[PDB]
Amino acid sequence: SGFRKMAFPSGKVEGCMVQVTCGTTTLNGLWLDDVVYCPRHVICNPNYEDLLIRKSNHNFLVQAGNVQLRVIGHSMQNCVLKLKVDTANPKTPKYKFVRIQPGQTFSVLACYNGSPSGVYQCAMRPNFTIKGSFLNGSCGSVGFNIDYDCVSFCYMHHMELPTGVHAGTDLAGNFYGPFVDRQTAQAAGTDTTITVNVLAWLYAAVINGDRWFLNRFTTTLNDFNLVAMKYNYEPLTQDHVDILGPLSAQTGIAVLDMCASLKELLQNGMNGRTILGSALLEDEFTPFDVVRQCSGVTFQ
Amino acid sequence: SGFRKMAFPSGKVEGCMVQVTCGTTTLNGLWLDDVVYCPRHVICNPNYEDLLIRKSNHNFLVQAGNVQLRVIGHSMQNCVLKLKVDTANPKTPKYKFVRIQPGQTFSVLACYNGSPSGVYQCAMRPNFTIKGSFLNGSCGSVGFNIDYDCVSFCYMHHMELPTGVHAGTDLAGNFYGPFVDRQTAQAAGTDTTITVNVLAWLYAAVINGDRWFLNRFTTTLNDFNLVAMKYNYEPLTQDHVDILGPLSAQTGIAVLDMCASLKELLQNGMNGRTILGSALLEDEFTPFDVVRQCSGVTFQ
Ligand SMILES: *[C@](O)(C(=O)NCCCC)[C@H](C[C@@H]1CCNC1=O)NC(=O)[C@@H]1[C@@H]2[C@H](CN1C(=O)[C@@H](NC(=O)NC(C)(C)C)C(C)(C)C)C2(C)C
Numbered sequence: 386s387g388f389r390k391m392a393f394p395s396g397k398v399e400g401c402m403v404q405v406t407c408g409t410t411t412l413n414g415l416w417l418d419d420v421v422y423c424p425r426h427v428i429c430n431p432n433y434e435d436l437l438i439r440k441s442n443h444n445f446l447v448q449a450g451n452v453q454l455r456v457i458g459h460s461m462q463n464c465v466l467k468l469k470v471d472t473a474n475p476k477t478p479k480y481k482f483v484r485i486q487p488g489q490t491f492s493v494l495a496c497y498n499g500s501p502s503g504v505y506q507c508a509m510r511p512n513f514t515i516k517g518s519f520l521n522g523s524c525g526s527v528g529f530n531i532d533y534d535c536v537s538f539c540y541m542h543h544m545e546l547p548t549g550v551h552a553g554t555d556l557a558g559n560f561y562g563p564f565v566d567r568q569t570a571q572a573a574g575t576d577t578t579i580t581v582n583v584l585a586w587l588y589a590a591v592i593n594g595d596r597w598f599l600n601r602f603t604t605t606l607n608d609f610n611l612v613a614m615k616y617n618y619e620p621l622t623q624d625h626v627d628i629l630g631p632l633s634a635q636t637g638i639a640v641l642d643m644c645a646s647l648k649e650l651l652q653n654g655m656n657g658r659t660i661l662g663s664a665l666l667e668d669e670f671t672p673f674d675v676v677r678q679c680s681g682v683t684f685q
Numbered sequence: 686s687g688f689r690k691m692a693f694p695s696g697k698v699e700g701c702m703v704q705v706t707c708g709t710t711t712l713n714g715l716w717l718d719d720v721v722y723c724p725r726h727v728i729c730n731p732n733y734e735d736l737l738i739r740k741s742n743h744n745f746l747v748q749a750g751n752v753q754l755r756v757i758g759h760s761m762q763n764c765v766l767k768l769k770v771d772t773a774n775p776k777t778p779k780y781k782f783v784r785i786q787p788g789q790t791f792s793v794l795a796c797y798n799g800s801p802s803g804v805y806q807c808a809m810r811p812n813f814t815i816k817g818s819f820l821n822g823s824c825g826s827v828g829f830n831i832d833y834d835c836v837s838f839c840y841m842h843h844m845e846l847p848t849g850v851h852a853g854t855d856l857a858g859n860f861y862g863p864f865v866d867r868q869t870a871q872a873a874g875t876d877t878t879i880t881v882n883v884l885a886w887l888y889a890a891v892i893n894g895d896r897w898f899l900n901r902f903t904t905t906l907n908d909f910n911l912v913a914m915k916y917n918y919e920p921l922t923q924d925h926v927d928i929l930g931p932l933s934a935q936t937g938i939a940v941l942d943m944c945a946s947l948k949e950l951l952q953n954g955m956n957g958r959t960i961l962g963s964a965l966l967e968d969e970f971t972p973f974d975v976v977r978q979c980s981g982v983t984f985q
């Protein structure tokens with residue numbers, strides 16, 4: 386048993402972490418096939434189409450270890466710079482590009498100068514920020530999910546908001562949330578808490594022995610939601626109750642039942658106890674995260 | 686900025702995760718060079734020297750993908766079965782074998798049937814248990830640390846204690862703590878909390894903007910320790926104060942000062958606030974973990 390915040394095996398992604406240098410700006414890139422993907426503010430309220438015609442393929446240093454790659458061409462898809470090189474990546478895995486919805490989770494391989502520093506487990510907060518760990522140097526690092534064999538890149542780093550959270554893009558260049566790669570005032574927007582994720586982790590608690598927080602009480606989907614707002618949680622949909630079923634099936638606790646217990650964790654807190662070793666209601670676990678860890682789905 | 690519980694990049698370890706099958710017992714193995722390492726209870730109060738003479742090299746199925754390895758010889762170093770095969774591992778990295786002390790942390794690559802499922806960040810609790818995530822199938826999975834380029838294997842899985850924690854060994858076969866690979870009654874022993882680790886993570890809090898928990902107050906090493914026991918924390922040594930210096934240097938808060946603030950977090954709790962997004966005092970971060978993440982040390 387057990388239950389940890391658990392990242393995907395980073396092997397297939399590490400092989401794709403390369404160094405991109407230009408002027409006095411060095412950030413990370415993602416070399417899949419013969420393309421290297423990196424955040425565009427490496428060519429630096431700038432005008433990036435302005436700045437990309439000024440540069441030539443030879444202005445873009447691309448180290449892949451002690452193996453400098455030659456750029457043969459470049460292009461700017463939204464906020465990503467796509468550097469064609471003269472060399473397919475031998476380590477390119479089966480991969481996808483995907484854009485996640487708020488609530489979903491992914492693993493961040495965190496690089497500096499093209500070298501992997503660490504891997505950890507984020508979700509995409511409701512306000513399209515992520516609570517990350519990114520120092521100066523970390524740009525061009527990717528979030529991702531692994532689907533049997535296929536890596537689904539869903540996030541590139543770019544910038545940090547003034548409160549300590551992090552902003553970024555799908556690998557299609559487009560930013561999650563209103564954020565934009567210029568040094569201007571821009572705010573996250575108030576973060577709610579992901580409700581279907583809090584329930585799931587509670588089913589993870591039940592699958593693991595913490596039952597202290599149950600009760601016979603049922604509630605309606607609505608009367609729960611009248612209490613979810615007051616506590617800054619997503620209103621819960623029936624479509625969430627649907628995904629929560631399998632866990633509800635394996636534990637026998639009706640989703641409406643566990644809602645009524647979450648209701649009670651909200652109105653009385655927790656009185657100095659823990660669920661799964663936390664004194665907070667953890668929303669960074671999706672219902673699938675739970676079923677994967679609490680059932681042992683691997684990746685080949 | 687930011688601060689997450691962050692695992693090492695698992696790439697070099699994944700390449701070494703193989704499947705070992707024998708009788709009706711299938712667990713994971715660690716193929717470095719021409720040796721495959723796995724927990725010994727794969728040949729199963731058994732007598733393991735008993736059971737290993739009964740078996741032959743041909744009784745040990747070793748898949749490495751769709752690539753069955755031939756065993757050419759075996760041996761039992763404490764609780765590890767060492768299977769010689771007829772094939773060096775091409776993916777064997779620079780590696781070490783090391784035995785960690787309680788308080789130290791490591792990354793667990795978690796496998797089933799030889800396939801990596803997930804990676805997460807443990808420490809070695811004071812009572813030589815680890816708080817892991819291990820289902821049936823997970824045995825032969827390794828903890829580790831990465832030192833520039835060198836992987837330091839420090840833990841193999843074996844068994845789960847009745848309270849939900851996990852027991853295991855250094856890769857030298859020997860179990861951390863009193864535990865033993867037989868199905869007999871055996872208890873963790875009461876877990877204290879790692880104090881030098883709680884301080885470090887607080888310096889991580891300071892390096893990151895949470896200052897709400899300071900105060901002008903200093904304390905002595907002793908008078909702090911009189912309060913550490915009462916709250917089930919390691920007594921703190923001067924030798925810990927020494928390692929905590931660099932963080933104390935970079936923040937300007939004297940180790941004795943931060944002790945006096947931890948004293949105050951213990952006697953009054955926290956009153957519904959958080960440090961680094963936790964409502965608990967997190968002890969799973971060493972002072973080095975902090976300096977690595979809060980400075981950006983990578984691995985090549
Ligand atoms: C990234 O580009 C990087 O890793 N730099 C290596 C290349 C050196 C030349 C950084 C990642 C940052 C650094 C630490 N934490 C992070 O998230 N990103 C940036 O440098 C980022 C790019 C400029 C300014 N950037 C910032 O991160 C800003 N954040 C903001 O400006 N925030 C606003 C938008 C004002 C709310 C700082 C001031 C460094 C936090 C761009 C294009 C925004």
Ligand SMILES: *[C@](O)(C(=O)NCCCC)[C@H](C[C@@H]1CCNC1=O)NC(=O)[C@@H]1[C@@H]2[C@H](CN1C(=O)[C@@H](NC(=O)NC(C)(C)C)C(C)(C)C)C2(C)C
Pocket residue numbers: 386709710711712726819820821822823824825843844845846847851865866867868869870871872
């Ligand atoms: C490991 O061998 C495995 O992954 N099995 C795959 C091979 C199938 C034939 C497991 C890992 C366990 C399973 C779930 N969580 C874990 O930590 N280890 C064992 O099966 C372990 C080996 C027997 C019994 N084992 C247990 O884990 C016991 N734990 C105890 O017996 N605990 C005592 C020692 C009584 C306090 C169970 C009952 C399954 C929890 C050995 C040799 C202990």
